[PDB]
Amino acid sequence: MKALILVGGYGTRLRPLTLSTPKPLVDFCNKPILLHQVEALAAAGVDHVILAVSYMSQVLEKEMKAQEQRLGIRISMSHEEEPLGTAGPLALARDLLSETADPFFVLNSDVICDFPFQAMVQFHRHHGQEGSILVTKVEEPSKYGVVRFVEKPQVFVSNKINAGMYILSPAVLQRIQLQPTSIEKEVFPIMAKEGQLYAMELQGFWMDIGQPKDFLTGMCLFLQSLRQKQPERLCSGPGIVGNVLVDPSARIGQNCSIGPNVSLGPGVVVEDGVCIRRCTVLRDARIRSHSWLESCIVGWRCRVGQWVRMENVTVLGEDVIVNDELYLNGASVLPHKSIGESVPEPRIIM
Amino acid sequence: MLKAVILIGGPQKGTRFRPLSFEVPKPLFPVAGVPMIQHHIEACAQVPGMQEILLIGFYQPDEPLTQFLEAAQQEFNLPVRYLQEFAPLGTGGGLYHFRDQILAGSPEAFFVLNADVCSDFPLSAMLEAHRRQRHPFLLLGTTANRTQSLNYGCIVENPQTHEVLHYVEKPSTFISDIINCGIYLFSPEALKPLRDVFQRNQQGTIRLEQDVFSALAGQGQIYVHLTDGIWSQIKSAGSALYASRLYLSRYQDTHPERLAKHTPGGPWIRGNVYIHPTAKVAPSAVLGPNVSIGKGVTVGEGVRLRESIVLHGATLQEHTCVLHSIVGWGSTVGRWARVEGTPSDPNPNDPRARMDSESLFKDGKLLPAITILGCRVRIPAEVLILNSIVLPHKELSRSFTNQIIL
Ligand SMILES: Nc1nc2c(ncn2[C@@H]2O[C@H](COP(=O)(O)OP(=O)(O)OP(=O)(O)O)[C@@H](O)[C@H]2O)c(=O)[nH]1
Ligand SMILES: Nc1nc2c(ncn2[C@@H]2O[C@H](COP(=O)(O)OP(=O)(O)OP(=O)(O)O)[C@@H](O)[C@H]2O)c(=O)[nH]1
């Protein structure tokens, strides 16, 4: 069985972070999210994956041609001249997704879940139809596309969102066109009028992590599943509250309170007396003393000064220097900005 | 010999200074460590020939005022008396009502100081000018910005004889750059126009600026004496912070042992900082510019304190940031809590300074000013109070921003 990953589409949600590294390469709990999906795929038994790649091609060349030796499987990159929707992937890669006449996975990259691939091939071989998708019950249906098929109902026609995982047999492969169409919007509409796609629901822990608030909620849910499945992964100690995922390279000072749902990247320096809750601190980001952070994303190589209160989904891009004794509330700071004045309003710093 | 009359107000003049005035009277609020009228009594007892200091007001003598009066009498080697007027008599009506007690012993001249002003009080130089010229009214004037001068009492003078030709208490239009400072030197003859004013009232309450300064302006009685040393008014609860900063800057000349030095094994000190000796400040607590610490104040480790007044008995737990705030008496600010305000000084030479009006709101929005905490306010851990006024005895549980917490 082969697999397809969709990747490259500009991350226009998660926008300060996705001007620096692509959306697959944002390290979600000390591991890139494309690395999450391909390690679960290579453990699921797929021998060959194809990454549709259009945006920021060269850094994904580097990461994936360096990780192919780590996973043990094969990865074929399919680069395009144009960013071609969500289905132009399959129509460029039609010649090697119809190699063997097998059903193939189609994965969104912004989805992190308990990947139920083994049960899902079993599901797919029982209705005999062409495509079968992963669905998830969501207790607020107006923001989300439920599945009949609609895309933005906001009506409560159904309750369960699409979870970004599909299996497609190769009859849909020479069905779609090369010029850009998005496979979830209008390919799936005639797929529904055909009667060929099916719905399979999983038990829990789904998150789309394309938006920064959703990125943080996915961090909280993933740290819960990492508490349950692998409790040796999480940190422990007196100054540690909740589920804290410290990298071995990351160093934390003394009399801190590194509270629940914190994931420190490789190489972070948290100084003496920081209080972090619900944050994601990425690689090489130094957080100075007597700062207080809650529900924020500190990007790569930022310096947070001292007595800095950051909160309410403040997202710092790459290499952002927050000066001392400032207060940020919803600042979505672009890369290579220094900040000298407080931001008490949800704002975008240019 | 001379004497001084400090016109303290009463409880209605302290209404504008309300969060702070709930506990202590306004003239006893500690501005840069000592009460507001102790700067006046300091500056008056420094004059050779000062017999008496007479506070006139309609406060009732409670425990803090009479204990302050005995403490001032011991500390300043003078009789400091408090003349309680039977009614709110205005500015000059209490000076006319107490003229028998003011002129008792026949002083050569007497000072009249408003209690709500912060100044260097150039009383010696005012006395030099008075003993040169010998006129009924000597006023102290400062130069203001042309835009800011409309908030104050404007004085049009004659720059050769220095005679006030015109006085207006708060003009709608531009009049002059000279503003009244609320410091005056009266000779005994100055109590004769006030009598006239009082007699005209019978066909008791005399406003000194509207009835005496504006009436005799240009007739030869009223004269200016100009300065540009430090001057501020203290009207609202947050102009006490600007007055505290100016006083902490002039402690570099008058009391340099009040200012705290770095001393590497102690707390890290930037700018001018007053720390009372009874206060315990942890050595990692950096106390930034223009901070004054009351007595009995336990400041924890990593506490950043900048541009603030922490009053008696307050407690700042670990890693707190307190900026442009006034922490009330006995208030406790739990760990990683941030009490932040916005600098808003009167400053009559600042062209961007606000009018210091009594309306704190523009249109439903609280204008960004100093964050006042009343007495006994418990600010919980990990919480932000931003540009807020908290009324006394309020235990909070929540972050507050641009709100008056009643
Ligand atoms: N190769 C390629 N991949 C694409 C293209 N368009 C979208 N994708 C992929 O589609 C995947 C999931 O779609 P989205 O979740 O909406 O992400 P997105 O493409 O960044 O689009 P936004 O909604 O603007 O964030 C992304 O990882 C993209 O890499 C494309 O034109 N070419
Ligand atoms: N003893 C005494 N002092 C007073 C009285 N009223 C005011 N004062 C003092 O004199 C100062 C004058 O304050 P205001 O009465 O507000 O007069 P103003 O400063 O000319 O300003 P306006 O309110 O526009 O008239 C006050 O700040 C007090 O220090 C009073 O009735 N008795």
Tab-separated table of N, CA and C in Angstrom, chain B residues 274-326:
chain	number	residue	atom	x	y	z
B	274	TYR	N	13.547	55.860	47.314
B	274	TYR	CA	13.434	55.948	48.760
B	274	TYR	C	13.021	54.592	49.306
B	275	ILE	N	13.765	54.076	50.275
B	275	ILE	CA	13.359	52.890	51.018
B	275	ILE	C	13.368	53.231	52.493
B	276	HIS	N	12.252	52.983	53.154
B	276	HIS	CA	12.188	53.098	54.593
B	276	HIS	C	13.032	51.998	55.235
B	277	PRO	N	13.639	52.266	56.397
B	277	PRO	CA	14.465	51.227	57.039
B	277	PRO	C	13.691	50.012	57.531
B	278	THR	N	12.406	50.151	57.874
B	278	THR	CA	11.649	49.016	58.397
B	278	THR	C	11.307	48.023	57.287
B	279	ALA	N	11.373	48.452	56.031
B	279	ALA	CA	11.035	47.592	54.911
B	279	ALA	C	12.139	46.581	54.643
B	280	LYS	N	11.736	45.356	54.306
B	280	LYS	CA	12.656	44.279	53.963
B	280	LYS	C	12.600	44.025	52.461
B	281	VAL	N	13.671	44.368	51.757
B	281	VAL	CA	13.740	44.243	50.305
B	281	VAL	C	14.733	43.147	49.953
B	282	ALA	N	14.281	42.167	49.177
B	282	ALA	CA	15.134	41.048	48.819
B	282	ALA	C	16.186	41.478	47.797
B	283	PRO	N	17.387	40.887	47.843
B	283	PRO	CA	18.489	41.399	47.013
B	283	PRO	C	18.324	41.184	45.516
B	284	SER	N	17.435	40.310	45.074
B	284	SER	CA	17.171	40.185	43.648
B	284	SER	C	16.056	41.108	43.172
B	285	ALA	N	15.439	41.862	44.072
B	285	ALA	CA	14.364	42.770	43.710
B	285	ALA	C	14.966	44.071	43.221
B	286	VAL	N	14.907	44.322	41.920
B	286	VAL	CA	15.438	45.563	41.376
B	286	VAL	C	14.371	46.650	41.456
B	287	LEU	N	14.711	47.750	42.116
B	287	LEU	CA	13.789	48.847	42.349
B	287	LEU	C	14.163	49.983	41.411
B	288	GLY	N	13.354	50.185	40.382
B	288	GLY	CA	13.685	51.070	39.298
B	288	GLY	C	13.498	52.508	39.677
B	289	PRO	N	13.568	53.397	38.690
B	289	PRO	CA	13.551	54.835	38.974
B	289	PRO	C	12.239	55.286	39.589
B	290	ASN	N	12.357	56.221	40.534
B	290	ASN	CA	11.242	56.948	41.140
B	290	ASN	C	10.298	56.023	41.895
B	291	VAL	N	10.872	55.204	42.763
B	291	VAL	CA	10.136	54.298	43.631
B	291	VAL	C	10.307	54.780	45.065
B	292	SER	N	9.238	54.737	45.857
B	292	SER	CA	9.335	54.983	47.284
B	292	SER	C	8.622	53.881	48.045
B	293	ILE	N	9.291	53.349	49.059
B	293	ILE	CA	8.838	52.192	49.818
B	293	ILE	C	8.456	52.650	51.217
B	294	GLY	N	7.256	52.303	51.648
B	294	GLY	CA	6.800	52.663	52.969
B	294	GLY	C	7.402	51.783	54.027
B	295	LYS	N	6.925	51.962	55.246
B	295	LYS	CA	7.451	51.181	56.345
B	295	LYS	C	6.728	49.842	56.422
B	296	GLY	N	7.442	48.822	56.882
B	296	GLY	CA	6.825	47.520	57.035
B	296	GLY	C	6.515	46.806	55.742
B	297	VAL	N	7.152	47.199	54.647
B	297	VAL	CA	6.865	46.652	53.329
B	297	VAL	C	7.810	45.496	53.058
B	298	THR	N	7.260	44.312	52.875
B	298	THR	CA	8.047	43.133	52.544
B	298	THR	C	8.007	42.944	51.035
B	299	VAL	N	9.119	43.235	50.373
B	299	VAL	CA	9.256	43.068	48.933
B	299	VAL	C	10.034	41.781	48.690
B	300	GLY	N	9.420	40.829	47.993
B	300	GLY	CA	10.016	39.529	47.768
B	300	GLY	C	11.111	39.544	46.720
B	301	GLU	N	11.577	38.346	46.377
B	301	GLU	CA	12.669	38.208	45.425
B	301	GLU	C	12.169	38.364	43.998
B	302	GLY	N	13.025	38.933	43.156
B	302	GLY	CA	12.703	39.143	41.763
B	302	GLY	C	11.635	40.171	41.482
B	303	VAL	N	11.198	40.919	42.494
B	303	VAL	CA	10.162	41.923	42.319
B	303	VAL	C	10.737	43.102	41.556
B	304	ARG	N	10.106	43.459	40.450
B	304	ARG	CA	10.454	44.670	39.724
B	304	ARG	C	9.492	45.768	40.141
B	305	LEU	N	10.033	46.868	40.645
B	305	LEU	CA	9.243	48.003	41.096
B	305	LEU	C	9.740	49.228	40.358
B	306	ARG	N	8.912	49.807	39.509
B	306	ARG	CA	9.315	51.009	38.805
B	306	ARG	C	8.214	52.050	38.875
B	307	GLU	N	8.602	53.279	39.225
B	307	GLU	CA	7.750	54.468	39.188
B	307	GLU	C	6.513	54.323	40.055
B	308	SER	N	6.678	53.782	41.253
B	308	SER	CA	5.543	53.434	42.081
B	308	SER	C	5.701	53.983	43.484
B	309	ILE	N	4.586	54.013	44.193
B	309	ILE	CA	4.539	54.221	45.627
B	309	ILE	C	3.983	52.941	46.220
B	310	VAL	N	4.745	52.303	47.095
B	310	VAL	CA	4.242	51.199	47.898
B	310	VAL	C	4.077	51.723	49.307
B	311	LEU	N	2.849	51.721	49.798
B	311	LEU	CA	2.534	52.342	51.068
B	311	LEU	C	2.786	51.372	52.207
B	312	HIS	N	2.527	51.844	53.424
B	312	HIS	CA	2.909	51.165	54.655
B	312	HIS	C	2.220	49.813	54.783
B	313	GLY	N	2.985	48.796	55.155
B	313	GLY	CA	2.426	47.486	55.410
B	313	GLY	C	2.040	46.661	54.200
B	314	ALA	N	2.467	47.022	53.003
B	314	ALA	CA	2.092	46.244	51.835
B	314	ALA	C	3.107	45.134	51.592
B	315	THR	N	2.714	44.155	50.783
B	315	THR	CA	3.537	42.970	50.565
B	315	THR	C	3.495	42.590	49.096
B	316	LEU	N	4.649	42.590	48.451
B	316	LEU	CA	4.771	42.160	47.068
B	316	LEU	C	5.473	40.815	47.075
B	317	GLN	N	4.738	39.750	46.766
B	317	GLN	CA	5.330	38.420	46.726
B	317	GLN	C	6.214	38.278	45.490
B	318	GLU	N	6.743	37.074	45.293
B	318	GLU	CA	7.874	36.855	44.397
B	318	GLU	C	7.534	37.120	42.932
B	319	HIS	N	8.520	37.648	42.204
B	319	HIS	CA	8.523	37.825	40.746
B	319	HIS	C	7.449	38.781	40.234
B	320	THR	N	6.940	39.684	41.062
B	320	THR	CA	5.929	40.625	40.606
B	320	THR	C	6.557	41.799	39.869
B	321	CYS	N	5.793	42.367	38.946
B	321	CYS	CA	6.141	43.601	38.256
B	321	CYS	C	5.090	44.636	38.621
B	322	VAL	N	5.519	45.734	39.234
B	322	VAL	CA	4.637	46.837	39.602
B	322	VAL	C	5.172	48.089	38.927
B	323	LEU	N	4.425	48.617	37.962
B	323	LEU	CA	4.840	49.783	37.197
B	323	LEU	C	3.750	50.835	37.236
B	324	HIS	N	4.132	52.073	37.558
B	324	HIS	CA	3.272	53.266	37.535
B	324	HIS	C	2.002	53.067	38.339
B	325	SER	N	2.158	52.504	39.522
B	325	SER	CA	1.044	52.136	40.363
B	325	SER	C	1.229	52.752	41.726
B	326	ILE	N	0.170	52.715	42.523
B	326	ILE	CA	0.229	53.081	43.930
B	326	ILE	C	-0.366	51.919	44.699
